[PDB]
Design a protein around this ligand. Structure first.
Ligand SMILES: Cc1cc2nc3c(=O)[nH]c(=O)nc-3n(C[C@H](O)[C@H](O)[C@H](O)COP(=O)(O)OP(=O)(O)OC[C@H]3O[C@@H](n4cnc5c(N)ncnc54)[C@H](O)[C@@H]3O)c2cc1C
Ligand SMILES: NC(=O)c1ccc[n+]([C@@H]2O[C@H](COP(=O)([O-])OP(=O)(O)OC[C@H]3O[C@@H](n4cnc5c(N)ncnc54)[C@H](OP(=O)(O)O)[C@@H]3O)[C@@H](O)[C@H]2O)c1
Length: 533
């Protein structure tokens, strides 16, 4: 274990994409910097989510770092969408290439942090009894990083084996000959389920609200195409940075309302055969207008009905009650096809709610299911869950957990008034998961670490967001969300999946590009909306 230093210019919490880049860039900027991370090695989500089928939904060529020309030229992606093992190899490659581990303490969880107004510094404690004095504190602790259990009793009475996809065993788990249940059909359950169906004697899929999924159509990556792309890589990334969604997705200029049914069908059919998430921007108003949205959703529901032979089973898979795209769009690989197998069962817990877990399985309001193993694909305590596990204290002993009890309050998502010198990477109040996260994450890490270099350059030692600019930012974030269909639906974006958590859409929806312009204008004017001393 790397004993962490007693004093540092910048402390970083988290060694996933965000944390490693912050460590890297801070080093280049001549600052002392060190990382604390709970896990035994680097990766973040790609270290933790080792469940079979784990795979990215953003193209390998887009979902990657661009800060290093060498890494761009040297690394060879192999598939349209990178599997978890492949991305963890990439992360390991990058960590090795810049000697990053020497600046990280592993197996160590930060527990508390308190700002000292006398010294303009943070003092940060860990579960190993370490205390670290840092002038700046960068929370790179994730968006989807605290596993959430589902809300029913009897979990600790189950006699069989119990798993969560976000805390998956390090060695392959063997489901051979078993009766297996999976609870949850978001992207984790959609990915892990077809893999388990290949080992288990019987698989029970416990669905509540159906999520919309479209075919991935993964494929080998052409090494022609790659070597070619490599010739203009820095240029291609810059094209992805100047978009709402951080990828080469085509921005459809028309309205899903202006077009005829025939042109609607033909256009959606070509996104469907191509595969991938780009259908989300097929028409400009899919996320803005309920009647627009509904023509798309209805096309997708019919595609779903047509994938499964038994029509009672197919109708059970059709998403109902919320607009298309307002929960995260999922990419599926042999998920729908799966339900055509003899040994796979769709359990509709909308009609038959789960009452309790029992020693032998799952009780709904209609019957009991006997199981040997149970897999929880029940998601995460998103965006705030990880910060809330740490006792973070601002000016006048204000707890972050209390100040944000009605939902997260930030200027630009980057900082919160009352908490000087503290930064969140790609979290609430910013574009975050509504963009290619590597483009969200690089922008934030660049902006924060520039900011810090600006502070040190100019002999300043305290950076704090102006409370009024915060409040105006929060209202702004809420106002632009309320022009979309996003706040209409219960998802983890809204916090609706953690019992008692306030239901407020937590993300900036105006697009990465515009958000980035705003941050650039701010930093240009000497960090307008911050007070520096
Ligand atoms: C399974 C999965 C697949 C994903 N696929 C996509 C994809 O399709 N497209 C996309 O753009 N992004 C996707 N993401 C979202 C993902 O959050 C981002 O892509 C990116 O990986 C986040 O990187 P990060 O470093 O900011 O956070 P993380 O990868 O979550 O890393 C945070 C790290 O901090 C650690 N940590 C938290 N609290 C503490 C503490 N108190 N003390 C010490 N350490 C702590 C955690 O152990 C974790 O290792 C996916 C998320 C998941 C869960
Ligand atoms: N390739 C990828 O892109 C990929 C893969 C995995 C994860 N991720 C990222 O992580 C986010 C979370 O993915 P996720 O699938 O882990 O979590 P999720 O999207 O939060 O879905 C959790 C699932 O479990 C269900 N659930 C929760 N509580 C339940 C209960 N008490 N009873 C029955 N069912 C219950 C939810 O049902 P309801 O919807 O009815 O609440 C939903 O089906 C994704 O949206 C994406 O951002 C990405």
């Amino acid at each position: 274990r790397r004993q962490p230093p007693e004093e540092v210019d910048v402390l970083v919490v988290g060694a996933g994409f965000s944390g490693l880049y912050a460590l890297y860039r801070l080093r280049e900027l001549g600052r002392s910097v060190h990382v604390i991370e709970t896990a035994g090695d680097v990766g973040g989500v790609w270290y933790w989510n080792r469940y079979p089928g784990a795979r990215c939904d953003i193209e390998s060529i887009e979902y990657c770092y661009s800060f290093s020309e060498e890494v761009l030229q040297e690394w060879n992606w192999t598939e349209r969408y990178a599997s978890q093992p492949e991305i963890l190899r990439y992360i390991n490659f990058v960590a090795d290439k810049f000697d990053l581990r020497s600046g990280i303490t592993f197996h160590t969880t930060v527990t508390a942090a308190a700002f000292d107004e006398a010294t303009n510094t943070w003092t940060v404690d860990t579960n190993h009894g370490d205390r670290i004095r840092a002038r700046y504190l960068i929370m790179a602790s994730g968006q989807l990083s605290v596993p959430q259990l589902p809300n029913f009793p009897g979990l600790k009475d189950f006699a069989g084996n119990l798993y969560h996809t976000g805390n998956w065993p390090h060695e392959p788990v063997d489901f051979s000959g078993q009766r297996v249940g999976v609870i949850g059909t978001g992207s984790s359950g959609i990915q892990v389920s077809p893999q388990i169906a290949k080992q288990a004697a019987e698989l029970f899929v416990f669905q509540r609200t159906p999520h919309f999924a479209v075919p991935a159509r993964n494929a080998p990556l052409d090494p022609e195409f790659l070597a070619d792309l490599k010739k203009r890589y820095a240029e291609f990334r810059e094209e992805s940075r100047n978009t709402p969604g951080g990828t080469h997705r085509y921005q459809g200029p028309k309205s899903a309302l202006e077009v005829s049914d025939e042109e609607l069908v033909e256009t959606l059919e070509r996104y469907w055969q191509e595969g991938g998430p780009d259908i989300l921007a097929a028409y400009r108003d899919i996320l803005r207008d309920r009647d627009a949205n509904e023509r798309v959703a209805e096309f997708i529901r019919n595609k779903i009905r047509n994938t499964v032979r038994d029509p009672e089973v197919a109708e059970r898979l059709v998403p109902k009650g919320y607009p298309f795209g307002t929960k995260r769009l999922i990419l599926e690989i042999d998920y729908y096809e799966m339900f055509n197998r003899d040994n796979v069962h769709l359990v509709d817990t909308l009609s038959a709610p789960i009452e309790t877990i029992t020693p032998r399985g799952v009780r709904t309001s209609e019957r009991e299911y006997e199981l040997d193993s149970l897999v929880l694909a029940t998601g995460f305590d998103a965006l705030t869950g990880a910060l809330f596990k740490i006792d973070i204290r601002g000016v006048g002993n204000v707890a972050l957990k209390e100040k944000w009890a009605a939902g997260p309050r930030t200027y630009l998502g980057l900082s919160t008034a009352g908490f000087p010198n503290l930064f969140f990477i790609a979290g609430p109040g910013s574009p975050s998961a509504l963009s290619n996260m590597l483009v969200s994450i690089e922008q934030h890490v660049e902006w924060v670490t520039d900011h810090i270099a600006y502070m040190f350059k100019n002999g300043l030692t305290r950076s704090e967001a102006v409370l009024e600019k915060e409040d105006e930012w929060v209202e702004h974030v809420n106002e632009i969300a309320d022009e979309t269909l996003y706040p209409m639906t219960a998802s983890w974006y809204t916090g609706a999946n953690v019992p008692g958590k306030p239901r407020v859409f937590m993300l900036y929806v105006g697009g990465f590009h515009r958000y980035r312009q705003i941050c650039d204008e701010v930093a240009a004017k000497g960090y307008e909306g911050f007070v520096l001393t």
